[PDB]
């Protein structure tokens, strides 16, 4: 599924991501924009041979199992394929664990390089939330 911006903002809010670990909804929508372009089916191979899955490009190195990332962990206890569903519940549940791990949203390099410090409010502008 390719979410609309406000559609994804509504879904993230419903699943309690708005102001989760102090990160406003616009931060999460901005991360999703630059990680996946709001596409739940997005997959990208990392240089280390891990893969990033779904709207928030969760990495098989630590968070989900894909069966092909040697010496990796599954800290969200989910198949990486579950992170490509049209229903973002699994991605949100896992993102809550990632952002709680100690470095906040710096875990998402695209958030750090493209969202951090910016007018992230713009990403929820016009949305009926
Ligand atoms: Na893994």
Swiss-Prot record:
Kindly identify the residues recorded as the active site: 35, 52
User: Can you say what this protein is called?
Assistant: Lysozyme C
Q: Name the source's superkingdom.
A: Eukaryota
Q: What class of enzyme is it?
A: hydrolase
Pfam families according to UniProt: Lys (PF00062)
**Might you name a Gene Ontology BP term for this protein?**
defense response to Gram-positive bacterium
Entry's SUPFAM superfamilies?
A: Lysozyme-like (SSF53955)
Q: Where is the C-type lysozyme domain?
A: 1-129
Binding residues annotated for substrate, in chain numbering: 101
Q: How does it assemble?
A: Monomer.
Task: State the UniProt keywords alphabetically.
Answer: Allergen, Antimicrobial, Bacteriolytic enzyme, Disulfide bond, Glycosidase, Hydrolase, Secreted, Signal
Q: Please state which protein family the record places this protein in.
A: Belongs to the glycosyl hydrolase 22 family.
Give the enzyme's EC designation.
Answer: 3.2.1.17
Q: Which reaction does it catalyse?
A: Hydrolysis of (1->4)-beta-linkages between N-acetylmuramic acid and N-acetyl-D-glucosamine residues in a peptidoglycan and between N-acetyl-D-glucosamine residues in chitodextrins
For this protein, the record's InterPro entries field holds: Glyco_hydro_22, Glyco_hydro_22_CS, Glyco_hydro_22_lys, Lysozyme-like_dom_sf
Other comments on record? Lysozyme C is capable of both hydrolysis and transglycosylation; it also shows a slight esterase activity. It acts rapidly on both peptide-substituted and unsubstituted peptidoglycan, and slowly on chitin oligosaccharides.
Summary of the tissues where the protein is detected: In the egg white and polymorphonuclear leukocytes.
Q: What does this protein do?
A: Lysozymes have primarily a bacteriolytic function; those in tissues and body fluids are associated with the monocyte-macrophage system and enhance the activity of immunoagents. Has bacteriolytic activity against M.luteus.
The places in or outside the cell where this protein is found are: Secreted
Q: Name one GO molecular function term.
A: beta-N-acetylglucosaminidase activity
Report the record's disulfide bonds. Answer: 6-127, 30-115, 64-80, 76-94
Cellular component, GO, one term:
endoplasmic reticulum
**To which species is this protein native?**
Gallus gallus (Chicken)
